[PDB]
Design a protein around this ligand. Sequence first.
Ligand code: CLA
Ligand code: CLA
Ligand code: CLA
Ligand SMILES: CC(=O)O[C@H]1CC(C)(C)C(=C=C/C(C)=C/C=C/C(C)=C/C=C/C=C(C)/C=C/C=C(C)/C=C/[C@@]23O[C@]2(C)C[C@@H](O)CC3(C)C)[C@](C)(O)C1
Ligand SMILES: CC1=C(C#C/C(C)=C/C=C/C(C)=C/C=C/C=C(C)/C=C/C=C(C)/C=C/[C@@]23O[C@]2(C)C[C@@H](O)CC3(C)C)C(C)(C)C[C@H](O)C1
Ligand code: SF4
Ligand code: SF4
Lengths: 186, 79, 86, 119, 663, 131
Amino acid sequence: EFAGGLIGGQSAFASQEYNFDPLGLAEKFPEQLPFFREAELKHGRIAMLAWVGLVVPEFVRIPGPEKCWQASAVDAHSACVXXXXXXXXXXXXXXXXXXXXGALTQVFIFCGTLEICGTWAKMNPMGLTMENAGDYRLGVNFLPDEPEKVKEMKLKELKNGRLAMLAFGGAITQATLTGSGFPWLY
Amino acid sequence: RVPGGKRTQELGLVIPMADEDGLTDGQVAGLFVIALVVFISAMDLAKTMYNGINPAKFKTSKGKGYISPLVKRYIENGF
Amino acid sequence: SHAVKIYDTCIGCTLCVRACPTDVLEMVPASINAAKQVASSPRVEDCVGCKRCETACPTDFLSIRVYLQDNEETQYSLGLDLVDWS
Amino acid sequence: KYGDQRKFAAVLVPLTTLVFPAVAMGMFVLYSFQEDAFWRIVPGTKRARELDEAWREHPLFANSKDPLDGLINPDDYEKGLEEAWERAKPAGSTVTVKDKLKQLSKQNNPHWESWRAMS
Amino acid sequence: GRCASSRYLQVLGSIHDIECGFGIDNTLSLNLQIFTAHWGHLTIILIWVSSNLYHIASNANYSLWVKNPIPSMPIAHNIWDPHFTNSTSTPYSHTIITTILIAYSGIYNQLYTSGFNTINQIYKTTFTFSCLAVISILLAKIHINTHSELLHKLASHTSQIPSFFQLLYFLDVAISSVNIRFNFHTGILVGLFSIGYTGHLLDITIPASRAPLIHTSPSYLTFFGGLKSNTSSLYLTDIAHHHLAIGIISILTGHLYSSFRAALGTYIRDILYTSHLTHSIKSLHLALSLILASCTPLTSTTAQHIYSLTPYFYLSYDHIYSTALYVHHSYITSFLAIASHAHTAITLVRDWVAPLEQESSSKQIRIHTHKAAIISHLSWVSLWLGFHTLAVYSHNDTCIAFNSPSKQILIEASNGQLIQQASGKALYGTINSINNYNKSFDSFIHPISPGDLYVHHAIALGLHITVLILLKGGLEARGSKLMPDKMEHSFGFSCDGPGRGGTCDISAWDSFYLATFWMLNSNAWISFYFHYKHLTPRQFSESSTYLESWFRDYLWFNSTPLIHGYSTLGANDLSVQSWSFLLTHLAWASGFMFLISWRGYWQELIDIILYIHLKTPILINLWNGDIYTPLALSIVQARFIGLVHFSTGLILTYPPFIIGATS
Amino acid sequence: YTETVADERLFEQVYLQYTSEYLKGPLYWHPDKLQGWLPDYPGTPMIKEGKYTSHVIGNLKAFSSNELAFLSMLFFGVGLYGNLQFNFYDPQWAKVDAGGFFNVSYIVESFLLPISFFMHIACYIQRQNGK
Ligand code: CLA
Ligand code: CLA
Ligand code: CLA
Ligand SMILES: CC(=O)O[C@H]1CC(C)(C)C(=C=C/C(C)=C/C=C/C(C)=C/C=C/C=C(C)/C=C/C=C(C)/C=C/[C@@]23O[C@]2(C)C[C@@H](O)CC3(C)C)[C@](C)(O)C1
Ligand SMILES: CC1=C(C#C/C(C)=C/C=C/C(C)=C/C=C/C=C(C)/C=C/C=C(C)/C=C/[C@@]23O[C@]2(C)C[C@@H](O)CC3(C)C)C(C)(C)C[C@H](O)C1
Ligand code: SF4
Ligand code: SF4
């Protein structure tokens, strides 16, 4: 069985299986395949949200700390974190800014808390397997009750995630190279 | 002070003494309270180490024991 | 009390029995040597521990071995004279 | 003044270097005459017997002192040993495995741990 | 029947030998007792730290020493002794003021470097460390209860199958687990402790050493070198960066073994099984031996590098701190070094299972196969070093007594000089490629002379002989040609009788007893070398190739201030030093009789004395001797007591000399 | 028949030969037979036939010998390049001394030399087992 029987390896021309793995990592690391699918789904979801929030600020910009909330999508990370002391280290000597402190570290700490009580709580305490890889039981009531419908919905999630990962890479690289608007072209 | 040794006399090394008290009596008493706590706890620990483990507690002691869920994992993870 | 053990390599010298100053050892009949006799230590409670038996034993390594047990000493194993423990 | 801590010293030094040491020595010589004295290193104390029996009462440590503990199916082991000895038994030898093991387990050492008779 | 007077010595000789306990029946009890003892010992250490901090806070002058550290002297604690003169003034007090003692530990520089400025901070630190002692004792109680609760949970435990008894081996998996312990030690206890100390330095130590600066920016991590000019110590920025680097490296290393999950990390057993090891890692004596052998290089390098590269403020400016610290840590590491071998011998006696006769698989097996070759070659190198060091020293002594200093044999220390030249070229290349050059390294490289070569050969001789005695004891602990049953007996036992040639000092413990004298002698040589080179580098460089120089220009000459301490002319503040000097001489000589005179003489003497007591009118009607029968000390107890007296005398005779010579 | 010493020795030999084979089996359960003790872990035999089994190299057990050889040589080249370009050619010490920063590529690469050593060890181990 290819890659422990995970959704995502089936071709689209049907009657065929893309089972894309030129490096053969699925057979080299079968004990970390659930972690591989966890990472793939996490990257896909983060990249979907990242592409959406790479397009949107070109139109609407939340009015806030003017130090951030300004500039191109490229100059929006190092600007919305400011000259932190070393890296993601709050300046306790001068909280309330007045020189150097973060503006996203709140997003960072929220992501850390959610991740620890999310993936870490799923793996360390009293358990992830092949089937429950990306399944955090979030919005499963919306999932249809049919064996193939769930499988095709998961496949659509996976393929949208891969497309969003590649799309975000291309979009951010083009924006860095050129600037410009949504087309991200010279 | 009457110094001894060649270097103290030939260099003028001196030992200053504070004219104040150092610690007030209240601070010494505050330290002695926690020292007494250490002392009581250490006497209890010495008693427990002297008597050692009692395996026959399961015949008389209440409860049913407990193995923490991580201790079970550490048991079955290996040695 | 010490522990005096006799091993199969005994050849019935009787020298160990003769050297014992407190009559700990004795000769018993056996069939494992040409002498048809081996030593025995039926009264090691009287073994002071002088190890004269080990000095007298001529086998390659002593057929009689005395194991000292200092946390075990009795009045007989200490040779107490001025003091009685009974 | 730099002194005024000697008010603590004049009580503590005599106390902890005379009263406590003397009380400790008297308590130690009193403890030396208890039947429980040095029960962990001195053989033949009552508490040592009680502790050993308490360990033996635990279901895990019942057959803990037996050097042969571990044989999951001792009957299978004994049967296999008897079968292996039958094919190697010398000529008309009259020794069986059962009595051979029984007489190899029974030695004659009366003066071993005889200190388990006072406490 | 009951016991004799030797019961006290017999009990106290194994008072902490938890393996020899009578109630202890399993590794669970042994491991839990050891863990609780560890907790109590940590509590003792914390209370000792709080003690020093309190006495510096209360009975001391830290607030004044911090202002002018170079010429000032710290105070250890007050003197309250009713035996002094209630009149006049002692030489340890400024007339009517209280009596004080000068601290030679070095805690003042430690606290000053760490960022302490006020007495109040030291008081709060004392309170916190007493709190930590409470916490440690409570953790001991907690773990005793948790293990007893597991034991009680065996009242609701059964596998429904005969394999349930397997749980017997996993009850102490909390203590006996190795992979988790290694992972968490090397990661947390080493790397993250270093990283936390880097944080401490960046937040306090560097801020409280210079003018106010930026918000602890990454410019606080420097790569200067050593010996900041003003304080004559390492740069605090360099120390913080060093701890940061060590912390990062050890944190990365700590993810090696399979600690919490079975899917990450390699097992230590599999690591050893595919190497030249695969030892019995379940032995507690083996682990103790190989970690004592780890604290030994650490403590020896601590002694070397506290002096060579002084890390504390104004530590090099104290002529007594620098020698006392070095000698103290050298003695500590010598004790740990001999401990490693002693517990290796105990491991071989008690906790080592060997193949039948020929299976050369275990490392100890392969060592034991050719142990005679090891001991013979160690004896050869020891003999060579002793012969050729003593003979050259004798040549120098004789030819310099005969008015011929130029007839000496002075081998120039060429190899050490080459190593020093290479290191100096490397350091100078480092310095020359700096825009902030003109740095100093203090005594990292020192002038090396023929006297240095001879003393190094003497030190190598001492180390070789100590290792020879210890290694012979370890290898023949399980049986030698003289006594081919030594593993049937205890680790320490009296002898094997006067027959078979005579068998005094035959146990492995007797090998340790013999080796402790050589450990003390080698440490004395090392300490004499360091102290002599510290007192006068020039005179050591020239006149130290003949032993008469060591006897005269060091011992006889430098003992002048100490003996003059108390005399019929008045007393100095060295009076305690001279009195302790004489007391330690008495202690050293008192242990000679426990070593030279042996038991039987004294047993007859005790029989005569007991005859007197049972013959004295009143005593006989109150005390017949049947209860606690007085007996002469047993042979092993006698050897140990003589060794203790000898060690105490030899060790404690030196600090008075150090204080008299340097202060 | 009487039990001669030779017959007793024969019983000793028979008993030892039988029991030494029996105790290796699943029916003796000694603490020295636990995981982490003498016996190998259940699914991970380390040494068989006097040869390092494929399970020694851990997660690399599935790698081919050619893949490990290529990785070994590539890592050796990259790590040696990093070490030589950090120490002797293109030194970074002067650049970082004046307030600069290390060429992070050199630092990352230089750690691939011992990795390459163990990678080529693993390549040989894989080749021996025919993988
Ligand atoms: C300096 C080392 C030293 C010392 C102190 C002693 C002391 C002694 N030896 Mg001895 N001995 C030594 C080395 C020494 N030996 C050596 C190297 C050998 C070579 C083998 C011998 C061989 C030897 C033999 C063969 C004999 C002795 C005997 C004696 C005893 C007779 C002297 C006596 O009773 O005085 C009293 C003891 C003193 C130490 C005098 C000083 C006492 C102090 C200063 C006063 C009390 C202090 C005070 C109470 C403090 C309290 C303690 C504190 C904890 C509170 C005595 C206990 C003989 C004996 O026991 O016969 C009676 C005997 O037969 N010795
Ligand atoms: C990977 C996702 C991601 C990341 C890292 C960022 C990061 C950033 N965004 Mg952004 N954004 C995103 C997605 C993301 N965005 C999406 C999906 C939208 C569309 C609503 C926007 C719309 C948006 C605007 C309008 C602006 C930013 C801005 C910024 C910058 C300042 C931070 C801020 O306040 O954002 C604000 C972001 C939001 C209010 C949208 C949050 C939506 C999150 C991603 C969904 C919640 C995820 C949660 C963990 C899952 C549970 C909920 C789920 C059921 C949906 C920062 C670089 C500001 C800036 O300076 O731009 C240059 C700004 O003005 N973003
Ligand atoms: C035939 C004489 C002879 C020979 C060839 C050797 C050879 C050896 N001995 Mg040696 N030894 C000898 C006599 C001899 N020994 C005597 C008489 C003693 C008693 C003092 C020793 C005591 C001794 C010790 C304690 C050690 C050796 C060791 C060694 C070995 C290393 C070399 C060494 O240390 O030499 C140095 C030799 C000495 C220090 C001993 C003194 C040399 C004697 C005086 C020479 C006598 C020669 C003899 C008089 C010739 C007469 C010839 C005539 C009758 C025709 C080497 C195999 C060492 C070893 O085992 O390491 C591998 C070691 O540790 N030997
Ligand atoms: C209680 C509760 O809540 O339950 C929850 C459960 C759950 C599951 C969390 C939920 C959900 C689902 C969610 C939130 C789904 C969101 C999905 C998103 C945002 C997908 C974006 C994909 C973007 C792509 C593919 C971009 C593709 C972009 C491409 C290909 C770009 C292509 C470009 O060529 C173009 C077009 C321009 C060129 O210049 C270059 C580039 C950029 C490459 C619910 C509904 O909330 C309910
Ligand atoms: C830049 C910047 C920042 C940033 C950033 C970020 C997030 C940068 C992210 C970069 C990122 C995310 C880059 C992804 C690349 C993905 C690639 C190359 C995929 C190739 C995929 C290929 C070539 C696929 C090929 C195939 O399809 C082919 C042709 C046939 C198919 O049958 C099969 C396959 C699959 C084989 C900071 C640091 C945050 C702040 C700073 O201030 C500004
Ligand atoms: S001396 Fe030895 S060999 Fe002779 S009879 Fe006695 S025990 Fe046997
Ligand atoms: S040690 Fe002495 S008393 Fe004991 S059996 Fe031998 S000879 Fe007899």
